[PDB]
Ligand binder design. Structure first.
Ligand SMILES: [Ca+2]
Ligand SMILES: [Ca+2]
Ligand SMILES: [Ca+2]
Ligand SMILES: [Ca+2]
Lengths: 302, 302
């Protein structure tokens, strides 16, 4: 019955030891301390009455190393260099973080999951996991003072930082930047109304979820009928679904269950029109917040 | 639109530093190292072909300090004392954990939320948050080798340990013990079929969720109609709902929204019969996995 699926985050200890407070004048938020560098959102430079359409190039010129104050609560880190990369600041400090994990920087793609360490005044307060939506937002839980909170995946011992929180959109979702300084999607780090693209169902995640149902004995939606990937994807474009792109992790689920991807693509088409009062894994609507990897790890132990 | 509600866990660093591997013969699982004590499930003593209806009193007598092997991966801790409390073992080791947090032991009550550190071979692998169901199970994500994984709440800096994982029930949910050694509910740490009590909707959590909808502008279900707590609770007993018991955290939500508890109790009664195609916070069915505290913290910042 119960699927054994939860929203699972990485353990956050490694990253907790990297979080700091960055203060610049009257703005304060979080930064990420790795080696001799502290990363943080650039709108920390901004006075709270210029946050809509600020000029960051001018703000940057007006700053010196002494404009920034960096404190660890969980020390005082003297800022000895400062630079801007896209929407992030890159502050150099005199002391290297002795608990710097092995890490990389990467970009996360729509439908992929990552873990977030929510932080306030440099103090980690919670952790959760999200999927990057097709419109390059996340359905997170961020309040005032959460900017600089980080998102990350993990491969073995290596932490892949992929997200630094910047803002909340009119519809309550959230977005931020990659550590190359680019905002995700077409968003800008300005407090003005911005067009929001439409979200979509992440087809590959829905397929993963239907497989999870099969692994827990729920398979009434499976028929011999099949829909080609190419045919589904044409359908997808007209129905607010991402185009499907199989992966080795989805293939493993097809092998373990003996149900072919194309049978579940047909199933999605029929379910999108209605569940007819039936339920799948307790839900009466499609679920796209679990990835094929989540299903492989949590249900199959792979 | 988006509620800003996620499944939020405490940051797990403090507890990660407390996890160890306990090996006894051919069984291995996780333990919790605080001060000079290592806690772990007692079925680690059990040979894998006696796990249904074992005699733990006899097993205990057959053990010595040298029967147990405790290793930290994230050292070797020499066991110098051993005792059993209910369904847990309490192993004394020569070295005190220098990263023992400030902590207490407590029992968690139905409808209350706690964070879990899932662990395998003494290695923390994920974190998630669950609500204790009215039948004293949790809807978790545990595999073989996860026993000894711990659940905890946090008050300030103090970690309140409330759960040590023991087993998975026929319907895929999970249960374990408190650190006083009692299993939650009427369950026993034996690998036999056991009656499972029926689950129920946690009324107080449903009310919290409806308030969360109001805080996000969704209030079509609110009417002037009211149902008394006493009247609701009589209704609850016939409809697989917990009886409602208000709290100061629920009262805060009533004050902030200007909607009285009794109006939402009436609403629950009507919604239980059907949403009539309408949605609440994206859902077409009642939600009882968010507590009044979650709503206060994540939506109101209290
Ligand atoms: Ca399972
Ligand atoms: Ca290091
Ligand atoms: Ca909000
Ligand atoms: Ca300590």
């Amino acid at each position: 019955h119960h699927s054994g699926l939860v929203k699972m985050s990485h353990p956050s200890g490694d990253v907790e030891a990297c979080m700091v407070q960055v203060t610049c004048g009257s703005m304060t938020l979080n930064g990420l301390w790795l080696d001799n560098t502290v990363w943080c959102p650039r709108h920390v430079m901004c006075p709270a009455d210029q946050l809509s359409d600020p000029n960051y190039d001018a703000l940057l010129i007006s700053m010196t190393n002494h404009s920034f104050s960096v404190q660890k609560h969980i020390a005082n880190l003297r800022v000895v260099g400062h630079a801007m990369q896209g929407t992030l600041l890159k502050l150099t400090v005199d002391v290297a973080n002795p608990s710097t994990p092995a890490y990389t920087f990467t970009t996360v793609k729509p439908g992929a999951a990552f873990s977030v360490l929510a932080c306030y005044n440099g103090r980690p307060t919670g952790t959760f996991t999200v999927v990057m939506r097709p419109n390059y937002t996340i359905k997170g839980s961020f309040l005032c003072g959460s900017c600089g909170s980080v998102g990350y995946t993990k491969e073995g011992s290596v932490i892949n930082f992929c997200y630094m929180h910047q803002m909340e959109l009119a519809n309550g979702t959230h977005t931020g930047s990659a550590f190359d300084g680019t905002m995700y999607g077409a968003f800008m780090d300005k407090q003005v109304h911005q067009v929001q693209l439409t979200d979509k169902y992440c087809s590959v995640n829905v397929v993963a979820w239907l497989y999870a149902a099969i692994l827990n004995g729920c398979a009434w939606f499976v028929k011999p009928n099949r829909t080609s990937v190419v045919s589904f994807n044409e359908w997808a474009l007209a129905n607010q679904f991402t185009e499907f792109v199989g992966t080795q992790s989805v293939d493993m689920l097809a092998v373990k269950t003996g149900v072919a991807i194309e049978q579940l693509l047909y199933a999605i088409q029929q379910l999108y029109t209605g569940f007819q009062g039936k339920q799948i894994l307790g839900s009466t609507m499609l679920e796209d917040e679990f990835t094929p990897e989540d299903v492989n790890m949590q249900i199959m132990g792979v």
